[PDB]
Every structure is written in C-alpha cells, then in structure tokens.
Amino acid sequence: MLMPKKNRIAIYELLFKEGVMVAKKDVHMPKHPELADKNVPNLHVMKAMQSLKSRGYVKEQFAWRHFYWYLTNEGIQYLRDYLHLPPEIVPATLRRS
Amino acid sequence: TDPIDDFQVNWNTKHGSGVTRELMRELNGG
Amino acid sequence: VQISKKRKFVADGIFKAELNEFLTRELAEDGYSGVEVRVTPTRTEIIILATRTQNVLGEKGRRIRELTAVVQKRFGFPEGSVELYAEKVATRGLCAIAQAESLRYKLLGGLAVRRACYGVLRFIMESGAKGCEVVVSGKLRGQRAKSMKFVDGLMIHSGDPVNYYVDTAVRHVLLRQGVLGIKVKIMLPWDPTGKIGPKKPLPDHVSIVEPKDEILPTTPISEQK
RNA sequence: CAGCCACCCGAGAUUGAGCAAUAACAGGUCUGUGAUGCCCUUAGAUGUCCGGGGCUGCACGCGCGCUACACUGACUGGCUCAGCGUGUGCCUACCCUACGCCGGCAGGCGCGGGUAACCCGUUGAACCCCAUUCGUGAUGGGGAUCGGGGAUUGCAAUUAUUCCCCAUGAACGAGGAAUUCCCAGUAAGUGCGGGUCAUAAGCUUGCGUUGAUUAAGUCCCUGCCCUUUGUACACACCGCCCGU
RNA sequence: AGGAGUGGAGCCUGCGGCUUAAUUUGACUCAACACGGGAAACCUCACCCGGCCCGGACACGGACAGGAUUGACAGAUUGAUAGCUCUUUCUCGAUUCCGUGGGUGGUGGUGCAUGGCCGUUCUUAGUUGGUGGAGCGAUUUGUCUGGUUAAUUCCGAUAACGA
C-alpha cells in the first residue's frame, strides 16, 4: 500500500523480465543484500511485491526468512488482460533446456 | 471413521453407548 | 572474503540445515529422504535421495531446473554453479523420514490412523528392519487429545547405540481439526557393508563362531583304489 | 554360588558427565517458529523515531544474590607460573590487541600483528607470598559513607558505563524463630573466560588456583523402593465421614 | 553426641504486599519468584503525565485533474529543529478515508482444542507381551522364599518357559 503508479509499472516490468525469483522480507532497512541498486526505492519495490503476492489471487509460503514463488497462469492472465501484453514475447527463461 | 478406533478412544465418554453400537455394526449384524 | 575455520564450519552446517529444510518443505510429497552435499574442487555437487524420482525431475526436468535455479539465486553461488541430482534410496522401508512422509500423506487425505500406522509398521518390518514404533499424538474428537502408539519388534532407547541404530522422524500433519504430530522410529539391523544398517554391532552382543558337525571314526585310515 | 572385606603390586582397585522404560500431569510454553484449530476488543496498529515517568524508593511484604575470625590476613617486586576459551561483510554500519603525548601505568591521536598452536600471548594497572608487622590483641591487622589527579570517550547514566592513593575509625575477632547446599582436588576462598554485549555483570555457563574440618553410618525427621497386612478411600487421606 | 560454609560484616536484582505517570504480562510448594537464556531509558514498557503517519480478495453506503504525507527555529507545544500551533492555501501527487469481520495479521485470546519441545512424578529400579498354569471373573503366575548387588544386579529357587 501507499504505492505510486510509476513504481507499479517498474515492478511490473521487473516481474515480466524475471518470472522466477527469490527474495527476503525487508522493509525499513536502506540497503539490500541481493535486490538493491535497482534505481528504484527499496521500500516501494518491496511493497509492490507484497501487493503482487498478497492481493489475494497468487499463493505464497513464508518460511526460513525467504520467499520462493510459483507464479500461476491466473496472474499471467490478469497481467495480459490489464496491460494487453501478449505472451508471444516468450520469456528468455526457456534457454539451457 | 474407524468403528474400532472410535471404540478404543471414547468408549468411556458421552458417546460411548453410540460408539459401542457403531462398533457392533462393523463387526457383526449388531 | 575470508572467515575463520570455526565460522566456516558453522556456516557450512547452517547451509546444510537450511538446504535440508528447504527441500523438505518443498517436496515432502515426492518421497524426499535427505540431502547430501559433496565437495568437489571449486564445485558443490548435491545429491537428493527420494522414493519417487520421476516426480522430482518431472517432465523435461522442469522441477529440477526451477529448484536448482532458485537454490543458485538464493545461496550466493556464482552464476550456474549449483547442480543437484536425484537418486533413489536403496533403503526406502527403513528410512524414518520417508516413512514419516508416507504416514503424513496417508493421513492428509483423511483416513483411519490405525490402519495407516499398522500398514507403515508392517511395511518397515517386511523391509528387514530390526524393530519399529510409531506414535501419533493429537486430536481424535472430543475435549481432549490422545496419543496412540504402535510398536513391533525390539528397540533401544538409552546409550550411544541409539545414535547409530535408531533413526527418528518427527512430522506435523495438518487436518481441519488441528495438528497431529507423528513420530517414526526404526531400529536398523546390523549389516556389514551395504549402508543398510550400522557397521558395528550392539556393544552388549558377543559373537562366537559356530563349529560344525563332527562324526568321525577313531583313527584316520588312508583309502586307495 | 553370587559376592563382600582387607592387603601387596599398581598411574589408577564402587572411580566426572552425557544418554536414558508404555501409563502419568488438563505441569509450562499459542510471547521461539504461514507449527497450528476461531468464539473476539480497539484506531490510544501493543509498527517506527540519540526522542520520552517510574521500578536505581527505605516503617523491608517475600525469594535468588554481593562477604573469612592472626605471625595463616596482606607490600618486599628479591626466582622460569595456570586456564577453559574468544577474536574483523550474505546480513554489516559494531573484532582481539602489541609505543609514545606523560601527571604515576587502561589511556582523547599516529602506529603494526592476528580469519589465529603463526598476533594478542610463554594470556600487559593479579600468586600468595614478602628486610613496611601485630608480644597479646582495637595496633600497623581485614574498610561506614563520602572530596581531588588525568576520566577508556557511552547524547542521557544522576532517572544501571568508566582507576589507586590522604590512613576520616564502622556491634571492628562463630549469629531471632526458621532453614539451603555439600563427602576430595567435596565445601569454601579466589580470580579469569564465554552468553547477554557498545571491552556493558551484582546473573548464569565454564575454567583453573589455594585448599579442605567432619562422615564410610542410620532410618529418628523428609521422602523413595522390591513385601505382608487393614480399609467404609478410587476426584484415591487435601479421601471418606458422624453429630441438636 | 558429626560437621563446614549459612540469609545477618564489605558490588541489586526477580515479583507480590504496597499514594496519582511506581510497584508494570507468562509462571499459585517442591515442579513460580537474575526464571521466559527477560542486564526495564529507547527499537523489546501493556502499571506509563502524552500522539501521528492508520485496513479491508467482500458484503452496502458518501463520488473525481484534489476528497492530504513522516516533512518551519523567532507569539508556542506540555520535555522534544514533531506543520499538532483554531496557523502557510510551500510540498510524492488519484496515492486514499469513515461505519462491522473474516484478510496481506494481531508478542490478539484460548497451553482446559493441539503439535513439537521441555520440566516433574522418579534418580529410584521399575515395566510388558506370547504360549503355558490358576480363577466364573476383574485379575494373577512369570516379575519369587532366601543370599547378593548401586541396580528386577546376579546366584539360586521354581507352573512356568521363552522373550
């Protein structure tokens, strides 16, 4: 919450570009171990991630102070319906198969 | 619901009488 | 860049513990038994033991590539540095973790606990185990929780031999009523070689080599044709 | 017979601990844990921000703690002493320490070593001893506060951090009722290191050092166990139960 | 008829008795009371003289280029370079807000719903099947008269034998 729309689209191209990620719950602290130096404020990026994975339509699992994600196709369908980005631009994650 | 397990657990409770009846059904035509 | 040997050993132990918990909480349904991290010059190869391997690799090795990638991006290894395999376990019937998961997934669907516990115990015994005991504690309807225990065979509790003769698994089963915890203990048989059981025998067990039947005449007489 | 006692010999002759049986308890923990089943308050979320009252009072309401009685207690600094252990980037901005400014040494600043049997350190403001001494015990012998010398540098410390000296004289030498722990390297004295941490300890967890009077027994008190016996108890003697 | 060191002679803490911001959660003998590894300014203070930046996958309501965000010493605040002063019409700018709860949860209740860990009964030597004896049966023998052991440890005895 308390999240601007430019940071929204920023976190959304981050989700588009990465897909499969790992993370840790950090909010107040000003430097980050593995998801810092992204030219965007840490707090708004992490709160937008909170919105992404806790809005109520993609499930999570919280343990050992870290996050591992299964990004369902319902979320992909929501993204395609909202931003109108077709899946024909496949993620580059399908290499080294 | 295992009739034998229910009997072994709460034969001595408020539901002991009904649990006994369910056990007798499972074993024979009781 | 460098930390002392005590800190290094402790960090290696923490890495092993967190990796084990991670691939315990991920694929407990896949028959996962345990992890074993092997050192290799400038490498860290990982072996996963599971009763079901087609399901940990999946189609086209999807699950393997995903969880290898997340382990890579998590544990600070350089790009493309972690490679984990998935091999079957030769002792499926007498591994405590595997049998605990088997019970938890026999109970998660909703089933009588006595039938499942007796089936698991019978299967462990028919796997050559020396003895077992299964404890299931939790809610069985009512205002009170009960603990029912199923034993068969012989089992030790005290001393050092329990460290290498008994393997223990404690698991939580989440039902709509609540949580019931299961406890599977298996007393491994004594077997030299094969890694099925401990190499040393029970320290209170003394062995004697057995002679054979000797029914012989009074004096040996050579016989020639 | 199991074994017991003693004695040579012997380094050592019931020798520290750890682990530890089903039934047990409505014992503690939901404030260690997206370990976990929902009846259910509030906006003064039991979130932040060197920020901020207490509790660091003294007619004590209680409990764990901080402490040795004499040529033994401590100084001459006149001979090589102990550890058990700890010590510097995923997080992270916080490590242990070897000369001089010099009042008399930690030390406000320059300086190197050590990710450690390599440096601290053959453990850098320590024995218990002793040509500062007690001639028979309030003196020199062990401290009632409480003041200065430069303070390790922690906004604050006083509403918990931070040295020895002037010898200023405190029932100054086995302790209401009640009692807790303890049998040999017990107890007790004594310092040191880990945890907590900013080198934060009066706490705890360990470690050495000095070093031990009494007892090798009993079932008297408090309990426990292996039996027989009695019971009107079984929520089990905190029981049950009688009487206007 | 033993003792040594005791809680009273030299380094303050725990929780109840116990004026308002002071006696502040969990733990009612052993089995609470430097115990929650809990050394309380403050992030962990709920007894606290005081506040702000506030929450809703939904059930229904107020309706769009403005419906406010920690964010000024000197007229002050109730300690506070906190704009909270009944104050500027500075400032990310559609972020949000009010009435009831499931929610991305609450170190929010309930440990008399639980798991897992512990603690204790209980530091003692105790405990249990199978088959066989006894009893209608609950149950008993095995698991014992003795001697011995730290020991249900062993010798031995023996309707018990094997464990």
Coordinates of N, CA, C and O in Angstrom, one line a residue, chain C residues 6 69 73 87-88 106 109-110 115 149 153 203 213:
Chain C
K6 N 36.3 -21.9 12.4 CA 35.1 -22.1 13.2 C 33.9 -21.5 12.5 O 32.9 -22.2 12.4
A69 N 17.7 -23.5 -10.0 CA 17.9 -22.1 -10.3 C 17.6 -21.3 -9.0 O 18.3 -20.3 -8.7
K73 N 20.2 -18.7 -7.1 CA 19.9 -17.3 -6.9 C 19.8 -17.0 -5.4 O 19.8 -15.9 -5.0
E87 N 18.7 -39.3 -6.9 CA 18.8 -40.7 -7.0 C 17.9 -41.4 -6.0 O 17.6 -40.9 -4.9
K88 N 17.5 -42.6 -6.4 CA 16.6 -43.4 -5.5 C 17.4 -43.9 -4.3 O 18.6 -43.9 -4.3
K106 N -0.7 -40.5 3.9 CA -1.8 -41.4 4.1 C -2.9 -40.8 5.0 O -4.0 -41.1 4.9
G109 N -5.2 -37.1 3.4 CA -6.5 -37.2 2.7 C -7.7 -37.4 3.7 O -8.8 -37.1 3.3
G110 N -7.4 -37.9 4.9 CA -8.5 -38.2 5.8 C -8.8 -39.7 5.9 O -9.5 -40.2 5.0
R115 N -5.2 -48.1 10.7 CA -4.9 -48.8 9.5 C -3.6 -48.3 8.9 O -2.7 -49.1 8.5
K149 N 0.1 -45.4 20.2 CA 1.4 -45.8 19.8 C 1.4 -47.2 19.3 O 0.8 -48.1 20.0
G153 N 8.5 -55.5 17.2 CA 10.0 -55.7 17.1 C 10.6 -55.3 18.5 O 10.0 -55.2 19.5
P203 N 26.9 -53.1 21.4 CA 28.1 -53.3 22.3 C 27.9 -54.4 23.4 O 28.9 -54.8 24.0
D213 N 29.2 -80.1 12.5 CA 29.0 -81.5 12.9 C 30.3 -82.3 12.6 O 30.8 -82.3 11.5

